[PDB]
């Protein structure tokens, strides 16, 4: 098991805020709806409200009756995140003791509700009673996407089994998760003619495959059957056959299904007894249907459906391949609803990162690491307000919007949000996981190989070996990454040659001698390491312009792995949003800010102006790096346009990921005088 301490100050703050937020939740309030539906004493507690409202006005903080709600979804994410925080290195010993006690109380409380519910309703024994079993699988009575909500609890239980230090808690989580899988099988055999894939079910196949790994031998086949009930093979077949069926599909609905296809692959290939239990046909389909569907999905998404920050979707859906400008700009800027601002739901990138991660673990292809790094910085890290810890729903791509974050719904950050009842969007629930597990994908151990997935100052150890690796990195503020190795034994360090680096300037020095950048068949350079190894890896950052396939005149700028944004106008977090959907905050457009994002070359064409951008961002470039590399931290990166007219001439471009106090431009409108 990896242990990774994080020395990067921006990521330390991000992770510490999340631990504080997780600690602000009370177990009895998380447990209210489970208890109520199971007939157990609720101790007069209220649920946390918003998407965690239930049907009953006396238990809902806002007093509403049968509101649109997603009961259990955020409780499930909280179990995941509080578990992840036990494994991660942001929480102190004392924070971990308290959060672990809280996790144990929630896991035991849900198990108790499950068991009490099973006696009230034997036919549905094993159901997690977050809401009425009568609305499975399509919802009803204001309860939306039941299987999606249950998926979070089931996924949560696996994380608690994996990461709780409390033996009873692990055993309780396993019993709960296996009993829920048995429920899925019993429910579906009783409702054999009911389609349970038409309504969003989250990553239920994924979670159940993960349950099969933890189940007792005599339960595995039952859990595998449950998992496979949630494999949408008709979708997978289309994808495997090289179709792009995505136009009109809900994006966050779809992505986790393919992570579940990959979990099937992993579950069967990593347990020889399971692998051997398949037919020859089934065995071949692991590769020809499941892996192939996921590989092809990932590729079509990144090539044809992805914005410069690694994100996808508009109004929560995929649209026409390549029509990114159209989706981001031709859907209105009026306040409220889901319009231009509704690009790049943040859940989608949490899911894309998990898909890239399991594709990496199976294939070792460096392209998945390049994507991971890019999207982790420019969509996930970018999603957080560094003062509050809260996270985004949408990420607008058209210029002139602010970033809008959620609220706590707890006494955390009361100086910002006062006594307001929380909302607990999906994006806030994936959000808490993003920051609880923030250090889980820096390095991957595989036999005596150690893959460097991202470049961050950190220290890596693993209980399976006796080497310690300390990385110091600041890219792209400074260009040298160093590694220092201590301990005993040997290993093979695997390094990516980033596409974002100026290729001819990349240099690898190992123990004071330059090494060639020879790649293995998966794209990795390999360095033998042992005690006292010292590596300097020079990665000069490339400045580049990235347009949309459907509009050469809508252009974002990126320096090394950091997408830049222009700071346009001041924003006020108290008034800069409206509502859309179910209690979702959506950004309000600033048309004066948008007007500043016109990039008008003083002389010549837009094409010639773009050609005059230099990769090294030096004097003479049409976009010039202005910060001193040797002063300030990474977020002090700063750029200015040159040879342009109007307001853009005076703007600062800085990292998108750290921009939150102003409206911003990621994509600029290139225009002739
Ligand atoms: Mg796992
Ligand atoms: Na083009
Ligand atoms: Na001001
Ligand atoms: Zn979401």
Cα–ligand 1 centroid distance for 363 (angstroms): 17
How far is the centre of ligand 3, averaged over its atoms, from the C-alpha of 660 (Å)? 13
Task: State which H helix or E strand residue 222 sits in.
Answer: helix 217-229
3-state secondary structure of 524: strand
**Cβ atoms of 317 and 249 closer than 8 Å:** yes
CA distance 485 to 471: 9
Query: Ligand 1 centroid vs 237 CA: distance in angstroms?
Result: 26
Surface-to-core class of residue 210, CB atoms within 10 Å of its CB (0-12 exposed, 13-18 middle, 19+ buried): buried
State which residues have CB under 5 angstroms from ligand 3, the bound ion. 570
Q: How far is ligand 2, taken at its centre, from the CA of residue 320, in Å?
A: 16
Three-state DSSP class for residue 415:
helix
Q: For residue 649, how far is its CA from the centre of ligand 3 (angstroms)?
A: 20
Is the Cβ–Cβ distance between 75 and 141 less than 8 Å?
A: no
What is the maximal distance between C-alpha atoms in the chain?
78
CA distance 114 to 100: 21
Strand partners, 12: none
Q: Are 445 and 21 in contact, with CB atoms under 8 Å apart?
A: no
Report how far residue 128's alpha carbon sits from residue 179's, in angstroms, rounded to the nearest whole number: 9
CA of 213 to the centre of ligand 1 (A): 9
The 8-class DSSP code of residue 519 comes to: B
User: Which ligand is located closest to the Cα atom of residue 567?
Assistant: 3
DSSP state of 290: I
Judge contact between 25 and 78, C-beta under 8 A: yes
Asked if 205 and 227 count as a contact pair (C-beta separation under 8 A), the reply is yes
Q: Which ligand has an atom closest to residue 548 CA?
A: 2
What token pair was written down for 369?
A: 């690491």
φ, ψ of residue 420 in degrees (nearest 5): -65, 140
Q: Which two tokens stand for residue 636?
A: 């002090």
Distance of CA 156 to the CA centre of its chain: 16
For residue 586, the CA-to-ligand 4 centroid distance in Å is 12
Q: How many CB atoms lie within 10 A of CB 115?
A: 16
What letter does residue 455 receive in the DSSP assignment? -
Tell me how far the alpha carbon of residue 575 lies from the centroid of ligand 3, in angstroms.
Answer: 15
Contacts 24+ apart (CB under 8 A), 648-652: 648/566, 648/596, 648/597, 648/598, 648/599, 648/600, 651/566, 651/567, 651/568, 651/596, 652/566, 652/567, 652/626
Q: How far apart, in whole angstroms, are the C-alpha atoms of residue 566 and residue 199?
A: 40
What's the Rg (C-alpha) of the chain? Answer: 25
User: Any idea which ligand is nearest the CA of 267?
Assistant: 1
Judged by phi (left if over 0) then psi (alpha if -120 to 50, else beta), residue 337 lies in left
- Beta-bridge mates of residue 143: 69, 140
- Any bridge partners for residue 2, and if so which? 462
- What's the token pair of residue 265? 């692959």
CA 136/CA 229 separation, integer angstroms: 15
Q: How far is CA 315 from the centre of its chain?
A: 18
Judged by its nearest atom, the ligand closest to the C-alpha of residue 545 is 2
What contacts 24+ positions apart, CB below 8 Å, involve 510-519? 510/534, 510/535, 511/535, 519/366
**In a 10 Å sphere around its CB, with 0-12 CB exposed, 13-18 middle and 19+ buried, how is residue 94 labelled?**
exposed
User: Cα-Cα-Cα-Cα dihedral of 83, 87, 93, 94, to 10°?
Assistant: -10
For residue 100, what are the β-bridge partners?
A: none
End-to-end CA distance of the chain: give it in Å, rounded.
Answer: 58
CA atoms within 13 A on the CB side of 220: 15
Whether residue 624 contacts residue 590, with contact meaning beta carbons closer than 8 Å, is answered with no
CB 215 within 8 A of CB 178: yes
Does domain 443-538 sit in CATH 2.60.40? yes
**DSSP letter string, 133-159:** GGGTTT-BTTB--HHHHHHHHHHHHHH
Residues in Cβ contact with 189 at an 8 Å cutoff, skipping those fewer than 6 apart = none
Q: What is the distance in A from the centroid of ligand 3 to the CA of 572?
A: 10
3-state secondary structure 477-498: CCCEEEEEEEECCEEEEEEECC
- 158 Cα–ligand 1 center, Å: 7
Ligand 2 centroid–CA 553 distance in Å is 9
**Ligand 3 centroid – CA 384 distance (Å):** 21
Nearest-angstrom CA–CA distance, 533 and 487: 10
How many CB atoms lie under 10 A from the CB of residue 480? 15
Number of the ligand closest to the Cα of 212: 1
How much helix, strand and coil, in percent to the nearest 5, is found in the chain?
40, 20, 40
Distance separating alpha carbons of residues 164 and 174, to the nearest angstrom:
12
Domain ranges of the chain: 31-196, 443-538, 543-670
Which residue reads 């292809």 in tokens? Answer: 365
Give the method of determination: X-ray
CA distance 500 to 315: 30
What ligand has the least distance to the C-alpha of 661?
Answer: 3
342, two tokens? 């509704």
Residue 69: strand, helix, or coil: strand
How many Cα atoms within 13 Å fall on the side-chain side of residue 562? 26
**Is residue 47 within 8 Å of residue 409, measured between CB atoms?**
no
C-beta separation of 465 from 444 below 8 A: no
Please tell me whether residue 271 adopts helix, strand or coil conformation.
coil
Ligand closest to the CA atom of residue 266: 1
| Smallest-distance ligand from the CA of 344 | 4
Q: How far is the CA of 39 from the centre of ligand 1 (A)?
A: 33
Q: What is the DSSP string of 588-638?
A: PP-HHHHHTTEEEESSS-HHHHHHT--TT--TTSSEEE-S-TTSS-GGG--
Distance CA 403, CA 221 (A): 46
| Ligand with smallest separation from the Cα of 570 | 3
Question: Do the Cβ atoms of 615 and 544 come closer than 8 Å?
Answer: yes
- How far is the centre of ligand 1, averaged over its atoms, from the C-alpha of 354 (Å)? 10
If you measure from the C-alpha of residue 173 to the centroid of ligand 4, how many angstroms do you get, rounded to a whole number?
Answer: 25
Both tokens assigned to 223: 């859990």
Q: Which of 505, 494, 496, 495 is nearest to 541 (CA)?
A: 505
For 424: left if phi > 0, alpha if psi spans -120 to 50, otherwise beta; the answer is: left
Other beta carbons within 10 angstroms of residue 282's beta carbon come to: 13
Q: What is the crossing angle of helices 347-363 and 426-436, to 10°?
A: 50
Q: Please report the DSSP string for 364-399 in residue order.
A: --HHHHHHHHHHIIIIIGGGB-TTT--BBS----ST
- Joined tokens for residue 539: 């990665």
Query: What is the rounded distance in angstroms from the CA atom of residue 627 to the CA atom of residue 654?
Result: 10
Q: How far apart are CA 435 and CA 440, in angstroms?
A: 10
């Amino acid at each position: 098991m990896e242990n990774v301490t994080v020395a990067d100050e921006y990521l330390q703050n991000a992770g510490k805020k999340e631990v504080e937020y997780l600690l602000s939740f009370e177990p009895d309030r998380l447990l209210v709806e489970f208890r109520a539906q199971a007939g157990l004493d609720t101790k007069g507690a209220k649920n946390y409200g918003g998407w965690e409202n239930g049907p009953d006005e006396s238990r809902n903080p806002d007093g509403s009756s049968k509101p649109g709600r997603f009961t259990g979804h955020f409780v499930g994410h909280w179990i995941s995140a509080a578990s992840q925080a036990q494994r991660s290195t942001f929480a102190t010993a004392d924070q971990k003791a308290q959060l672990s006690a809280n996790l144990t109380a929630v896991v035991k409380g849900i198990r108790e509700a499950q068991e009490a519910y099973a006696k009230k309703d034997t036919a549905n024994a094993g159901f997690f009673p977050a809401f009425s079993a009568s609305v499975v699988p399509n919802g009803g009575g204001g309860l939306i996407v039941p299987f999606y909500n249950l998926h979070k609890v089931e996924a949560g239980m696996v994380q608690a089994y994996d990461y709780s230090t409390d033996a009873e808690t692990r055993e309780t989580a396993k019993a709960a998760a296996v009993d829920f899988a048995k429920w899925v099988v019993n429910w579906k055999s009783a409702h054999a003619s009911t389609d349970m894939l038409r309504t969003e079910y989250g990553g239920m196949n994924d979670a159940l495959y993960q349950v099969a790994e933890i189940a007792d031998a005599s339960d595995k086949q039952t859990v595998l059957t449950a998992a496979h009930l949630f494999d949408e093979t008709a979708l997978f077949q289309k994808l495997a056959n090289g179709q792009d069926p995505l136009n009109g599909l809900h994006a966050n609905t779809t992505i986790p299904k393919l992570t579940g296809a990959m979990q099937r692959y992993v579950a069967y290939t990593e347990d020889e007894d399971l692998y051997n239990s398949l037919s020859a046909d089934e065995r071949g389909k692991l590769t020809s249907l499941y892996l192939k569907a996921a590989q092809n999905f990932f590729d079509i998404v990144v090539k044809d459906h992805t914005y410069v920050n690694g994100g996808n979707s508009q109004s929560e859906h995929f649209h026409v391949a390549g029509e990114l400008w159209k989706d981001a700009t031709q859907n209105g800027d009026q306040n409220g609803g889901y319009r231009n601002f509704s690009t790049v739901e943040t859940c989608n990138e949490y899911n894309m990162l998990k898909l890239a991660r399991i594709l990496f673990q199976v294939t070792k292809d460096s392209k998945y690491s390049e994507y991971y790094e890019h999207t982790f910085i420019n969509a996930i890290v970018a999603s957080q307000n560094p003062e509050t810890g809260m996270t985004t729903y949408f990420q607008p791509m058209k210029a002139g919007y602010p970033k809008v974050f959620g609220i706590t719904g707890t006494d955390y950050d009361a100086d910002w949000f006062g006594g307001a009842i929380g909302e607990y969007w999906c994006c806030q629930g994936t959000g808490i996981e993003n920051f609880a597990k923030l250090n889980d994908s820096f390095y991957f151990t595989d036999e005596n190989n150690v893959y460097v997935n991202m470049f961050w100052s950190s220290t890596y150890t693993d209980t399976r070996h006796n080497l310690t690796i300390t990385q110091t990195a600041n890219v792209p503020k400074t260009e040298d990454v160093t590694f220092e190795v201590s301990g005993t034994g040997s290993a093979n360090l695997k390094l990516r040659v980033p596409d974002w680096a100026i290729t001819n300037g990349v240099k690898l020095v190992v123990d004071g001698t330059e090494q060639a950048l020879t790649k293995d068949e998966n794209g990795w350079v390999t360095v033998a390491i042992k005690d006292g190894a010292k590596i300097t890896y020079t990665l000069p950052a490339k400045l580049q312009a990235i347009d949309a396939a459907d509009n050469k005149d809508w252009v974002a700028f990126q320096y090394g792995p950091v997408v830049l944004a222009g700071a346009l106008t001041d924003t006020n977090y108290k008034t800069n949003y409206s509502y859309g959907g179910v209690k979702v905050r959506v950004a309000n457009y600033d048309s004066e800010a948008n007007a500043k994002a016109a990039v008008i070359p003083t002389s010549g064409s837009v094409t010639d102006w773009l050609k005059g951008i230099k990769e090294d961002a030096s004097e003479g470039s049409n976009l010039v790096r202005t910060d001193d590399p040797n002063t300030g931290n990474r977020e002090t990166l700063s750029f200015k346009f040159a040879n342009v007219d109007g307001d853009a001439a005076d703007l600062t471009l800085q990292p998108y990921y750290s921009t939150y106090k102003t409206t911003y431009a990621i994509y600029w409108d290139m225009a002739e005088v």
